[PDB]
Design a protein around this ligand. Structure first.
Ligand SMILES: [Zn+2]
Ligand SMILES: [Zn+2]
Ligand SMILES: [Zn+2]
Ligand SMILES: [Zn+2]
Lengths: 676, 1263
RNA sequence: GGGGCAGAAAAUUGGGUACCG
RNA sequence: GACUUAAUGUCACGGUACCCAAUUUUCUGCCCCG
């Protein structure tokens, strides 16, 4: 009777932790105390436990498997270990057989749900065949109560997903008020093969997906259902993919005030499905051109909606620095909302439109599709008012880029031959940016790039010919992280020229002695407060400092000024008077963003924070050059502020990759980040 | 067509792994992780023995890496012939993948060898790779290999049976440490193999083409690392003793258990382990501590009879039986066996279950992503190799963690924390700890870095990993093989200020001043500024101290090393690569490079002259120097200091219970340790003092748990999830040379409340350091503060330092009786300015109450009455116990805290004897057995012990407050415990509450709230002079024998009378005029000669209180000074009349948590008046307070009433009967003997009990 | 006619930690 | 010459056994009748 009262004090704590009015920070401690007292009971009565306590141990293992969050991009080992221990602790209860009749139902229910979660998060250890056999035995032991037990619905839906016929169970499945829209849609699709009712239930699921946060399990199950619908070549996966994309967009608009979204692994592949769906509604024969142009515009809106925010990890969110205390409340509100949604799943100003481009400009949106392994370039032309798209492959381009990155990080100036090879590989991979039909001649081009193509010099592309032509010799190149960063009415409104300097190694003594530099905040040994002390919107700001890249948080990447320097977050909060200000940075981009190892990176430098403040354009260096070239750019900008950067790049000798690759290395490094 | 024989030798402990062929290798995690290690195969059946080897594929991989690096150094050519780039890709369509895939970058060059390589003619690199051979990817026959690498067998020097795994390898858990939290992420295990005896391997390499012979023989000497160790490649042309120890341990445990002393065995185990610190002579020549002299029972534990013989003699026979295993192994095995038998006999065997798994992670393979990344250096580039040779010195005791024994067994306790050691019991700094500390300091110097990701198909391109991939280190083994030091640690409950349950543990530390070699190698094009800054940060110069934190107790300040004797040498690899191949890069001979002169350096190795100093380095002084700031101070303690050790006291001569803590310091000039140990206060102790001060000031000690907590205490001092932001070091005594007899012997005893004498088995000694107010001790201490501290946290640390200076937190043990009281603090000039500024910016009172004394005995008849010297106080036997016990976790706002400064005046001569010297003045040369003493003094300054004043005030307070008998003995004559009431029994446990005396002065499981300091002599005439004595002072006392309860309680139906008190009388003049009649007619062994102080002398002492209620402070102020004509009794010779003292309250200060008050005379009367109402409320029978209204207080105060203070020529006669007439000292016709006063005819018993219970009742007329 | 006591009682370990597409 | 490698491709020198805890609480060197 000591085991009885210890099990009841553990079962009270388990059901209090299983209450949807409990905060998760309390839930972890409560469920660990209950698991502690059950584990101590096991330690003292090692092999003489009843099955009634074994089911409590297995339920505690299921509940700790719920509250273990992925702090990165991989499933943690603790969740798999918790599910494994619950499986064997229920296995000894099954080997303790011939107890009560309801105990067999409860034990096989706990076993089947634990095996379902293990098969979901680890397919190799928990196969489909063993799961099919166990869930087959579970309904043989009478686990078909769809009206008082939520988990029996999951058993039936997983079983009909596996392949066995459940035509008898269907009428008992549908009338339950514990079933939800996605389960009813899977029941209508997999058992009765009804497309018509499943479409209505899936649209109801899509409509309910609007108000639930992305950490909820409904998103994972929905994207898995759409991936299964694409797996058997169904006709309904395209519409469901576009509906789920629209729901994800309107949900992602509702996130906390920073450019942040929750990371879940399927969030990419949903976009990678939805893009493909619109693509299959374009290349497949559509008789009217006006719907096809709308589809090619929808592709460029899908890519921009992906490129807006950058999806931080969980450990970086917990290690977030503290400043602007109301935004601290907003960020912790976002974090607790996401974690509460994750466990709640188991406990039961003006964006410029894509056609608002000035005359004589061409906009190139990029997308890297990891499902099909392709790269899509979508071009919008304002003079013709047309939309087109082309494909390329990015594997060998990624290879040559990683070769240049390794050679650069070892021998910074002497990687010029690898830079010429990378530029020729960009020109050979993408011939469509040298033909007249895709990009017209003499027209300004704004690139809106994606993934590792952000770090590629697109202006230095060499055409696949013998007398190879550089790309910047005919077009004016501009860059942008996403189309949501573009603005209207730059409004510089002043004429003051401001300089900041912190480092003394670079021989800028002749630059700081110049007459033109304005009356406020021109320094030597500048600090972060001096950057925050800009009064009213200067014409040109020049920040000369070293750069520091935090390898996990872009919010902790900082510019090396005095007394600790200024970070991305301190830029986004503290500096106010820089609306419509041309900025020139002395820090290279390789010191501002970390080097990358995967094909996908979403990392924003301080130039994007400067654009979010309201600056009109930021001119920087992609990699490290000597101080004389940056001084020459600053002096040419001071003498000529209106003139374009590709003219200076052509005049300095940047068209001579064949004879002097150091000059080509120093010339094409300069990139403007803005949209005039 | 000629074979060559290759010998591979190691100079570091290499790595071993179990052998699985190709698919069972994929089945296991350790096999896939250890693919570049040595392989172990089991031989026979039983899984006990086998043999190790190195596969030829691994040696081939190292060889082709050396060939690639040699050709990349010399622009793609070797000895004039050019080599092409080679092939390192394999198409999947034609052939399979070659069983290992390369992830690193491949060095390439401009290939100009006039031709493309075909089967007919090929370059030396192409035939050395084995491209155009007949066999590939499936082994058919050992011929048709152009170059063939055989398996490298372990060159066992002498042939024997099958080699066991435990004789070569030893497992060890390695770690991954998070940079941001200072905590481990996960761990993994590996096998480290012996290299001193099993570090030579032999194999064969077969070439069939005399065109790649020069390149192969050149690159064999360029291979530097294999199997996790530095290597050279050359070409040639007591299980039985344990069981008897277990049986003798069984005999010892059973002999202890028969004597009901089982729990000593645990202590004994530790003592036997401490016997490894001393030599064998401590058992041989009987250096173990003997018992007290002329005592039938010997030592506390070393004279316990085991099979009729003492434990020292049994240990001597056990050592004589086992002389062949050595002293150290004998003591360690004996202690381990005794601990194992004790843990078996107790019944708890330490289960150690882990929920949610066991965080042991091995790195994993993801398919796809097969990349070939070529790296081409520039033509002109100049590559060099820098070797830094130096010496690590431990500036603090160090700690390198390792698992428990019987867990580092590769095939399949007593000390909680062991230290990493070699096979010859030498201290070891492993390569992995140096590599992790270098990675951490390089991430600090660069400012950015990566957390080390384990599953990777693409090499990380951060600056830290790029510089670390060309840094090679070497493990260091000291030249010292003496055993570690066991340091004990406890934890404190903040509520009761006592030890928590299960909080004792022990750590093994290494000696400070120890010395290890240090080798660093960097191969590259330019020496980095950040690596130079890390080396300059680690090393020490004049003024600067080294900051190399290695090891695993950094918050306790353990493991701060300093680099010295730094010599950096440069090797030119572009011009003098042949000398590198010839000299093997000085691998294994770096010891010779330190003592090498300039003219003895090899060709190619030059000194490096362009090594930047500290001031010229940019990442230094901006990233590394402000990382930790030093705050160094000096505590001045003007009281005795005792941080008890209690295990080494059991193994040292002197027979002392508690001794001070000592350290072992190692010296490098002479290879011994030190002749004399250095006294210290541990870093754990003052770390806990700072932590408790900050936690009580803010209120974070009151929380029930600190998991996932972000309070100020957990931010400053660390928690489970984070490392501490402050690191504490030891407080070392620096003025120990100014003292004569630095350690003082101070002995104490517990006095029974009824008999008035010493309680049985309640006498003890202490040996603290002699601290006096005019000659204080000075302890120099240090702590380091990490950058990032806010103004509030710096304010908190300076407030804690001010609390330590103000005397709120005494050091060591026995702080409530005046030990370890801080008298002052000093702050050095190297402390920063803000910390210095915060630390620098921080009448006749009487009681006027006259008691009406007993008027019937003395104020009626003047000098014709004889009173008994002791009377008994009887109370109502109803005590009030409070279960809401005031806790020590915070300074409560309603309650009072501060100090009372008081002065003590002697009405009568005072005897406080110094029992440190039993010979004292002189006078044992004249006669043997005569005990004579001096007054109690520390360093010549006369003092009263604080324990005496505390016991006197407690014996007054419990009588005033009707408390239980705190010190009481239940003994011979049923027992005295049966006659005593249950309410007056001593309070055991907090469940039934605490009486007010035990609430204020504390119990075992609750610390007291009043602390009594040592009193110091100030003014007056010392040394009451008597002419007929051998000194001018110091009169000789008479007999003093033990009190008998049988006179107090005869005829069993008679209950205990009460607490015994002694009257105030000038009976000392009778002793003063009987000095000639005391030396004769009394045996000289019986009586004692003691130094005496005259009346009128003044002493000064202070009482510190905290968390006091108002009535408790009022009752304390009343017990300190009850009124006019009321005094206390203190010291020796209380029945003879010595020791009446009167205490005046000079001042009272009360503080709040931020100023010091004065509290004028009106409020202390309010406190005493509030205290009086509590006794009125407790009595039940409900103005300046008249204390005689309450019944027991009047009976108490007439006992404490002095009859000669205000003029009265009242001089009462107070003495004992003289047994039998005919006895010396008889008064003429008194009829005053115990024969006529105790015989149930004359004085009827009950009348005698009435006579002993009514104070100042006349006894010779016997009213 | 005579000396006793010379240490006693607790705690002797508890937990924590698995970034890597 | 088996035990015991596969050969045109092994970053394991790719990973600090790391973090948290005051040897401390209570005790007058004291004392008379078989
Ligand atoms: Zn070749
Ligand atoms: Zn790295
Ligand atoms: Zn806390
Ligand atoms: Zn009590």
């Amino acid at each position: 009777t000591r085991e009885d009262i210890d099990r009841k004090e553990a079962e009270r704590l388990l059901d209090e932790a299983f209450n949807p009015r409990t905060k998760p920070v309390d839930r972890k401690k409560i469920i660990n105390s209950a698991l502690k007292i059950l584990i101590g009971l096991y330690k003292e009565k090692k092999d003489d436990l009843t099955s009634a306590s074994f089911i409590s141990i297995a339920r505690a293992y299921y509940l700790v498997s719920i509250t273990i969050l992925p702090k990165g991009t991989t499933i943690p080992e603790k969740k798999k270990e918790a599910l494994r221990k619950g499986i064997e602790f229920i296995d000894r209860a099954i080997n303790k057989f011939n107890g009560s009749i309801l105990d067999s139902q409860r034990a096989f229910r706990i076993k089947s749900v634990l095996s379902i979660e293990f098969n979901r998060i680890d397919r190799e250890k928990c196969d489909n065949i063993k799961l099919k056999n166990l869930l087959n035995e579970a309904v043989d032991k009478g686990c078909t109560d769809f009206d008082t037990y939520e988990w029996d619905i999951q058993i039936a839906i997983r079983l009909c997903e596996l392949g066995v016929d459940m035509e008898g169970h269907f009428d008992n499945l549908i009338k339950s008020n514990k079933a939800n829209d996605l389960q009813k849609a899977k029941a209508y699709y997999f058992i009765k093969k009804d497309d018509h009712k499943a479409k209505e239930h899936m649209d109801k699921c899509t409509a309910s997906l609007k108000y639930t946060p992305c950490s909820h399990r409904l998103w994972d199950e929905t994207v898995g259902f759409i991936e299964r619908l694409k797996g058997d070549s169904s006709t309904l996966w395209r519409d469901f993919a576009i509906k789920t994309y629209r729901s994800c967009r309107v949900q992602e608009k509702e996130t906390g005030t920073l450019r942040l979204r929750w990371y879940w692994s399927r969030h990419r592949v949903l976009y990678d499905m939805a893009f493909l769906a619109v693509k299959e509604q374009a290349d497949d024969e559509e008789p009217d051109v006006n719907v096809k142009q709308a589809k090619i515009k929808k592709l460029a809106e899908i890519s921009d909606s992906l490129k807006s925010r950058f999806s931080l990890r969980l450990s970086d969110m917990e290690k977030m620095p503290k400043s602007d205390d109301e935004s601290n409340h907003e960020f912790k509100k976002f974090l607790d909302k996401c974690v509460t949604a994750y466990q709640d799943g188991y406990v039961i100003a003006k964006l410029l439109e894509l056609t608002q481009v000035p005359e004589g400009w061409v906009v190139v949106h990029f997308y890297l599709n990891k499902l099909e392994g392709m790269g899509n370039a979508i071009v919008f032309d304002k003079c013709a008012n047309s939309w087109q798209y082309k494909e390329f492959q990015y594997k060998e381009l990624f290879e040559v880029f990683l070769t240049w990155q390794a050679n650069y990080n070892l021998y910074k100036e002497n990687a010029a031959e690898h830079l010429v090879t990378l530029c020729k590989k960009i020109g050979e991979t993408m011939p469509f940016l040298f033909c007249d039909n895709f990009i017209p001649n003499g027209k300004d081009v704004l690139f809106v790039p994606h993934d590792f193509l952000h770090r590629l010099p697109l202006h230095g592309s060499i055409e696949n010919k013998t007398n190879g032509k550089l790309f910047l010799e005919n077009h004016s190149c501009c860059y942008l992280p996403a189309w949501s960063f573009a603005s209207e009415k730059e409004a510089s409104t002043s004429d003051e020229y401001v300089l900041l300097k912190n480092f003394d190694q670079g021989h800028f003594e002749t630059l700081q002695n110049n007459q033109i530099w304005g009356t406020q905040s021109v320094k030597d040994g500048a600090s972060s407060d001096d950057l925050e002390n800009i009064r009213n919107n200067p014409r040109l700001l020049t920040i000369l400092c070293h750069g520091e890249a935090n390898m996990s948080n872009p919010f902790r990447s900082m510019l090396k000024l005095a007394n600790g320097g200024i970070t991305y977050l301190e830029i986004l909060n503290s500096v106010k008077g820089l609306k419509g200000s041309q900025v020139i940075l002395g820090a290279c981009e390789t010191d501002l963003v970390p080097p990358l190892s995967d094909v996908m990176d979403e990392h924003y430098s301080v130039a994007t924070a400067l654009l979010l403040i309201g600056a009109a354009g930021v001119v920087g260096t992609m990699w490290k050059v000597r101080s004389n070239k940056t001084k020459s750019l600053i002096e040419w900008k001071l003498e000529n502020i209106e003139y374009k950067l590709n003219e200076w790049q052509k005049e300095t000798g940047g068209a001579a990759y064949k004879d002097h690759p150091p000059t080509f290395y120093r010339s094409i490094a300069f990139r403007s980040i803005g949209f005039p | 067509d000629m074979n060559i024989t290759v010998e591979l030798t190691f100079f570091e402990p290499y790595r071993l792994v179990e052998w699985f062929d190709w698919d069972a290798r994929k089945k296991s995690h350790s096999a896939m992780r250890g693919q570049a290690f040595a392989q172990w195969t089991w031989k026979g059946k039983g899984r006990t023995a086998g043999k190790s080897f190195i596969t030829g594929t691994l040696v081939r991989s190292a060889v082709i890496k050396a060939v690639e690096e040699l050709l990349s150094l010399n622009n793609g050519k070797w000895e004039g012939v050019p080599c092409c780039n080679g092939s390192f890709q394999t198409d999947e369509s034609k052939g399979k993948k070659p069983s290992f895939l390369r992830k690193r970058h491949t060095l390439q060059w401009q290939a100009n060898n006039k031709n493309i390589c075909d089967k007919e003619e090929a370059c030396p690199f192409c035939i050395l790779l084995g491209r155009f051979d007949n066999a590939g990817k499936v082994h058919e026959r050992n011929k048709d290999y152009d170059i063939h690498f055989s398996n490298f067998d372990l060159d066992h020097k002498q042939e024997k049976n099958d080699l066991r795994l435990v004789d070569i390898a030893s497992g060890r858990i390695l770690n991954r440490v998070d940079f941001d939290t200072g905590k481990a992420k996960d761990y993994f295990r590996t096998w480290e193999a012996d290299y001193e005896t099993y570090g030579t391997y032999t194999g064969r390499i077969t070439l069939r083409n005399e065109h790649a012979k020069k390149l192969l023989l050149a690159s064999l000497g360029f291979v530097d690392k294999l199997c996790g160790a530095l290597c050279r490649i050359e070409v040639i042309k007591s299980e039985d003793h344990n069981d008897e120890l277990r049986k003798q341990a069984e005999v010892i445990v059973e002999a202890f258990k028969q004597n009901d002393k089982l729990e000593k065995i645990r202590i004994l185990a530790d003592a036997i382990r401490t016997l490894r610190l001393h030599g064998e002579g401590v058992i041989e020549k009987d250096e173990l501590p003997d018992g007290k002299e002329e005592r039938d029972k010997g030592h506390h534990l070393w004279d316990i009879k085991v099979q009729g013989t003492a434990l020292r003699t049994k240990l001597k026979e056990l050592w004589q039986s086992n002389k062949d295993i050595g002293w150290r192994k004998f003591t360690e095995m004996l202690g381990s066996n005794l601990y194992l038998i004790y843990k078996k006999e107790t019944g708890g065997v330490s289960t150690r279950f882990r929920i949610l798994g066991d965080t042991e992670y091995y790195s994993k393979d993801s398919e796809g992503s097969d990349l070939f990344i070529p790296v081409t250096p520039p033509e002109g580039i100049e590559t060099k190799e820098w070797i830094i040779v130096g010496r690590l010195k431990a500036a603090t005791p160090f700690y390198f963690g390792v698992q428990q024994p019987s867990d580092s067994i590769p095939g399949k306790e007593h000390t909680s924390f062991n230290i990493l050691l070699d096979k010859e019991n030498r201290y070891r700094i492993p390569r992995s700890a140096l590599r992790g500390a270098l990675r951490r300091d390089l991430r600090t110097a660069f400012g950015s870095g990566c957390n080390v990701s384990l599953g990777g198909q693409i090499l990380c391109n951060c600056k830290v990993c790029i510089e670390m991939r060309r840094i090679t280190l070497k493990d260091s083994v000291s030249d010292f093989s003496e055993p570690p030091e066991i340091r004990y640690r406890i934890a404190k409950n903040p509520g009761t200020a006592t030890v928590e349950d299960g909080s004792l543990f022990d750590i093994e530390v290494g000696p400070e001043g120890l010395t290890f070699p240090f080798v660093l190698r960097y191969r590259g094009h330019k020496f980095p500024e950040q690596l130079s800054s890390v080396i300059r940060y680690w090393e020490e110069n004049d003024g600067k101290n080294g900051m190399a934190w290695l090891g695993g107790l950094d918050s306790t300040g353990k493991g701060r090393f300093a680099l010295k004797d730094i010599k950096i040498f440069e090797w030119d690899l572009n011009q003098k690569i042949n000398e590198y191949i010839k000299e093997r890069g000085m691998r294994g001979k770096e010891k010779e490079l330190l003592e090498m002169g300039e003219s003895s350096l090899p060709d190619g190795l030059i000194p490096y002259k362009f090594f930047e100093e500290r001031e010229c380095l940019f990442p230094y002084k901006e990233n590394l120097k402000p990382q930790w700031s030093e705050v160094q101070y000096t505590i001045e303690v003007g009281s005795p200091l005792l941080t008890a050790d209690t295990i080494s006291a059991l193994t040292e001569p002197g027979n002392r219970d508690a001794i001070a803590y000592k350290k072992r310091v190692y010296n490098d000039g002479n290879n011994a340790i030190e002749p004399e140990p250095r006294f210290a206060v541990k870093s754990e102790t003052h770390r806990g003092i700072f932590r408790t001060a900050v936690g009580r000031r803010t209120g974070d000690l009151g929380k029930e748990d600190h998991e996932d907590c972000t309070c100020d205490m957990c931010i400053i001092f660390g928690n489970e999830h984070e490392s501490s932001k402050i690191r504490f070091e030891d407080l070392e005594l620096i003025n120990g040379n100014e003292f004569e007899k630095l350690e003082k012997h101070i002995d104490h005893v517990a006095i029974d409340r009824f008999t008035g004498g010493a309680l049985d088995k309640a006498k003890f000694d202490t040996y603290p350091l002699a601290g006096s107010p005019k000659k204080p001790l000075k302890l120099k201490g240090r702590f380091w503060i990490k950058k990032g501290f806010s103004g509030d946290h710096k304010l908190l640390i300076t407030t804690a330092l001010s609390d330590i200076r103000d005397g709120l937190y005494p050091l060591g043990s026995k702080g409530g009786v005046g030990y370890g009281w801080v008298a002052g603090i000093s702050i050095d000039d190297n402390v920063p300015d803000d910390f210095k500024e915060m630390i620098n910016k921080t009448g006749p009172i009487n009681n006027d109450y006259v008691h009406p004394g007993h008027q019937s005995p003395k104020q009626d008849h003047k000098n014709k009455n004889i009173y008994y010297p002791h009377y008994f106080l009887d109370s109502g036997s109803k005590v009030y116990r409070e279960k809401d016990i005031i806790t020590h976790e915070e300074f409560t706002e309603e309650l009072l805290s501060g100090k009372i400064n008081c002065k003590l005046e002697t009405l009568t001569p005072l005897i406080i004897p110094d029992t440190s010297d039993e010979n004292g003045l002189k006078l044992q040369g004249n006669k043997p057995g005569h005990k004579n003493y001096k007054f109690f003094n520390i360093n010549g300054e006369l003092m009263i012990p604080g324990s005496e004043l505390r016991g006197m005030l407690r014996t007054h307070f419990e009588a005033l407050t009707k408390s239980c008998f705190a010190i009481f003995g239940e003994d011979s004559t049923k027992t005295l415990g049966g006659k005593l009431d249950k309410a007056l029994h001593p309070c055991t446990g907090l469940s039934d509450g605490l009486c007010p005396g035990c609430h204020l002065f504390g119990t075992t499981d609750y610390k007291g709230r009043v602390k009594f300091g040592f009193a110091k002599y100030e003014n007056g005439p010392e040394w009451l002079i008597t002419r007929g004595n051998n000194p001018e002072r110091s009169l000789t006392l008479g007999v003093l024998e033990s009190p008998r309860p049988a006179f107090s309680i005869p005829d069993d139906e008679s209950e205990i009378p009460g607490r015994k008190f002694y009257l105030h009388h000038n009976g000392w003049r009778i002793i003063r005029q009987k000095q000639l009649e005391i030396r004769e007619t009394v045996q000289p062994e019986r009586n004692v000669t003691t130094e005496v102080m005259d009346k009128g002398n003044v002493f000064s002492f202070d009482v510190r209180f905290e968390n006091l209620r108002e009535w408790e402070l009022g009752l304390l102020l009343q017990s300190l000074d009850p009124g006019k004509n009321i005094a206390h009794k203190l010291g020796k010779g209380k029945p003879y009349g010595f020791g009446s003292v009167k205490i005046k309250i000079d001042s009272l200060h009360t503080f709040k948590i931020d100023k010091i008050k004065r509290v004028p005379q009106s409020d202390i009367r309010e406190y005493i008046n509030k205290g009086y109402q509590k006794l009125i409320e407790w009595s039940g029978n409900n103005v300046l307070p008249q204390w005689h209204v309450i019944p027991h207080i009047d009976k108490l105060y007439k006992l404490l009433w002095v009859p000669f203070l205000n003029d009265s020529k009242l001089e009462p006669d107070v003495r004992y009967p003289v047994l039998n007439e005919e006895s010396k000292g008889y008064i003429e016709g008194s009829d005053y003997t115990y024969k006529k006063l105790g015989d149930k005819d004359n004085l009827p018993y009950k009348t005698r009990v009435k006579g002993l219970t009514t104070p100042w009742s006349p006894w010779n007329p016997f009213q």
